[PDB]
Amino acid sequence: GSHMALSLTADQMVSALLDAEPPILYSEYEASMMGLLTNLADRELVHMINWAKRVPGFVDLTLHDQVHLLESAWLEILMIGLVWRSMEHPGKLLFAPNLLLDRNQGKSVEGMVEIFDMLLATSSRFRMMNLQGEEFVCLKSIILLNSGVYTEEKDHIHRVLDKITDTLIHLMAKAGLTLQQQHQRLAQLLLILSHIRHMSNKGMEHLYSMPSYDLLLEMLDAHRLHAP
Amino acid sequence: LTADQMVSALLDAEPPILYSEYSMMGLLTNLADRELVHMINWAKRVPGFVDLTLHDQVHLLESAWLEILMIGLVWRSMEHPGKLLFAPNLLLDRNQGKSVEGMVEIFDMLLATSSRFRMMNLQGEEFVCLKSIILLNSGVDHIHRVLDKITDTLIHLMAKAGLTLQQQHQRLAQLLLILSHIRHMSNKGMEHLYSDLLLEML
Ligand SMILES: C[C@@H]1Cc2c([nH]c3ccccc23)[C@@](C)(c2c(F)cc(/C=C/C(=O)O)cc2F)N1CC(C)(C)F
Numbered sequence: 537g538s539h540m541a542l543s544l545t546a547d548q549m550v551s552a553l554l555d556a557e558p559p560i561l562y563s564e565y566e567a568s569m570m571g572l573l574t575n576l577a578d579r580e581l582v583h584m585i586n587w588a589k590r591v592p593g594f595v596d597l598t599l600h601d602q603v604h605l606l607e608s609a610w611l612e613i614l615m616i617g618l619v620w621r622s623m624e625h626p627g628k629l630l631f632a633p634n635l636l637l638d639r640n641q642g643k644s645v646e647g648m649v650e651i652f653d654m655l656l657a658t659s660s661r662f663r664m665m666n667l668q669g670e671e672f673v674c675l676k677s678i679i680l681l682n683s684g685v686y687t688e689e690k691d692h693i694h695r696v697l698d699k700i701t702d703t704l705i706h707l708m709a710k711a712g713l714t715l716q717q718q719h720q721r722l723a724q725l726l727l728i729l730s731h732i733r734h735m736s737n738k739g740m741e742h743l744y745s746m747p748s749y750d751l752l753l754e755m756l757d758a759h760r761l762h763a764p
Numbered sequence: 765l766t767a768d769q770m771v772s773a774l775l776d777a778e779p780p781i782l783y784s785e786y787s788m789m790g791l792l793t794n795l796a797d798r799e800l801v802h803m804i805n806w807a808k809r810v811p812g813f814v815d816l817t818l819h820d821q822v823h824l825l826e827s828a829w830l831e832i833l834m835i836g837l838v839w840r841s842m843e844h845p846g847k848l849l850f851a852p853n854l855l856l857d858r859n860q861g862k863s864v865e866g867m868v869e870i871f872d873m874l875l876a877t878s879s880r881f882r883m884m885n886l887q888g889e890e891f892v893c894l895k896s897i898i899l900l901n902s903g904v905d906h907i908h909r910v911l912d913k914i915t916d917t918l919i920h921l922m923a924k925a926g927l928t929l930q931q932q933h934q935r936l937a938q939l940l941l942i943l944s945h946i947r948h949m950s951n952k953g954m955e956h957l958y959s960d961l962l963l964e965m966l
Pocket residue numbers: 570573574576577580611614615617618631651738739740742743747
């Protein structure tokens with residue numbers, strides 16, 4: 537059977553997202569650091585396509601719409617994944633369990649330190665808020681559906697986004713927060729998403745100064761040929 | 765402040781709608797320059813903004829100024845589909861943006877934001893809460909406390925407007941997600957722009 541996105545209960549949504557989670561990858565072991573970080577990003581992207589196809593409502597969109605969303609969100613998704621992993625490592629970014637880099641290691645590449653500092657600050661914010669795994673998967677799905685939303689069909693994305701918000705609220709209510717604390721926590725998290733967008737924009741600026749629609753269209757389509 | 769006193773203080777702080785002078789880039793830069801002076805006056809009236817040090821006030825305004833100009837523009841343009849109401853005497857269509865290189869992509873994103881606010885039926889009381897959120901958030905414990913207060917104010921407005929508990933969180937989320945889009949637009953604008961006034965006014 538197949539659950540349509542808008543029929544999922546909060547528990548079914550959490551179960552589907554937890555099941556969709558990509559694995560934690562290892563680094564293949566200043567030019568060497570950039571090479572290792574690009575290779576890791578390339579490998580995470582293959583898993584990100586598999587994950588996006590399992591995000592409720594994503595497959596309901598046309599292939600062209602799926603590509604637009606992934607093209608706009610891929611760096612924000614890699615970054616939220618990085619900051620989540622790095623939570624328990626103050627002052628460091630856990631790119632991989634065998635690639636834990638300090639702030640000073642980022643200074644070896646020009647313009648990279650400002651991005652590393654913003655990522656560290658986001659990781660510190662999630663740590664202080666005690667972000668839960670179930671909340672993290674909801675936020676990452678929201679980035680996917682929201683980042684390219686304003687760039688019937690549009691109503692469907694917004695209704696799926698409402699379902700994910702209901703899921704975040706349900707998690708917070710079960711965790712013991714009052715209705716007021718639920719709204720404050722949801723707002724805090726969504727405001728952090730605007731900083732994640734900021735980081736991706738600064739990241740993309742750096743990339744273009746030295747992962748296209750075409751590459752993503754081919755990878756999203758090639759997924760149909762993978763074994764079940 | 766109660767939620768109603770917060771809304772009253774924000775509505776009272778609202779800057780005026782300015783007119784364009786009597787070429788498109790020149791008129792738009794001059795209008796932005798004039799709106800900035802009013803934006804500083806508005807910022808000083810946002811509860812909690814004067815509680816911050818002068819250096820913190822400057823940091824927040826420096827990080828948020830383009831997002832604030834853009835949200836203001838998008839709010840004004842709501843009742844004008846396919847157009848950006850820069851001023852009552854300067855209503856520009858999408859095609860008029862194509863006269864300047866790289867400007868069309870920004871105009872399209874602003875038009876899409878205006879269309880989203882129109883479809884959500886964004887209220888004036890909600891708009892002033894969002895604009896205060898951008899100011900305190902873009903360059904971000906006291907600030908976090910004020911941010912928590914603005915969320916409570918948005919919820920209070922929605923509850924008084926007759927939304928259910930469920931509709932309140934869904935609407936709060938939809939309004940705050942648009943702030944990620946406003947951030948994106950401001951970053952794209954800063955990119956285009958790069959390719960003392962604040963201290964004196966404060
Ligand atoms: C710190 C970020 C985020 C990040 C990166 N690598 C990750 C791996 C796993 C998880 C997160 C990341 C890295 C280091 C990065 C990246 F995400 C993508 C590429 C792609 C290259 C290409 O297409 O030719 C290159 C990179 F260096 N960025 C840097 C930028 C400037 C993008 F913000």
